[PDB]
Amino acid sequence: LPPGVDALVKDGEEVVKGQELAPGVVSRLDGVALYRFPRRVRVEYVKKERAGLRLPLAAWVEKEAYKPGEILAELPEPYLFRAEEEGVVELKELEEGAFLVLRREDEPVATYFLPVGMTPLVVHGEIVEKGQPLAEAKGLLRMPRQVRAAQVEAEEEGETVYLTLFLEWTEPKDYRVQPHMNVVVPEGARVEAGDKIVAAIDPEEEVIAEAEGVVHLHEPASILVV
């Protein structure tokens, strides 16, 4: 495989003769494709948290859970989502959508969820006071493609809804594998905290899994069709 080019087919995949394995590489025979020494291991970590949101009651669609991509609300006019606590802002941006975490004396006092269609008006590490706008919400706002909503609780106060969302999403982290390291974990494996993913000559060069996640192999040196 040409250096840096990533494969189309996945480790284990049945392949027909003539099928294209890589941008410039075409398989000459049918059989099972096997990745030859993966250069980059990507671990998608499983995170399950609790985050809040407040919306105009007329703008929100009632549901018990929200699947990825689903429309959460549709706003007739732009809405300023405001902080309900004072704190310093920890901004954590996902692929699409964002997380916002207010903390005062260390201990996080709030976790808010900004879906797509909501542009943060604050930056990481910004001091906010109760009531100042965190994010603008304009038009249709929906769940991001990479993040789900397992449970949706709703309290109604005045003209707004406050959603307490139980959210599940995966955060990618890339690890580089050197020629002297071997991947000891299969594609699609389930790992807990402490499980070894890549091994190396010495202990400080090993890659140990930080928490729960699933493993994906990318950019192999070559593909072996057997």
Binding site: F37, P179, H180, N182, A221
Partner: protein, 85 residues
């Protein structure tokens, strides 16, 4: 010409094979411990099955004559091991 049909190893491939070879020898030592069997005798049985039925012969160091009967017998003790062993 025959030499030229085996591609040269990449640094990765070279390290991988060497690594697997070292790990395999450590395994044979370990398999010796578990079974209480001669490490060399075990090694010839392991090696016999990889090279195939083609090459089976008496080994000067082995105490027992090495023939398909004994490698099947010994292989069956190996196939009687618990999953982690």
């Amino acid at each position: 010409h025959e030499i030229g049909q085996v591609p040269l190893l990449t640094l990765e491939e070279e390290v991988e094979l060497a690594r697997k070879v070292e790990e395999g020898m450590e395994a044979i030592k370990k398999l010796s411990e578990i079974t209480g069997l001669d490490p060399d005798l075990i090694r010839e049985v392991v090696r016999a099955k990889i090279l195939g039925s083609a090459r089976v012969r008496h080994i000067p160091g082995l105490k027992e004559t090495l023939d398909p009967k004994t490698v099947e017998e010994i292989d069956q003790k190996l196939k009687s091991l618990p999953k982690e062993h």
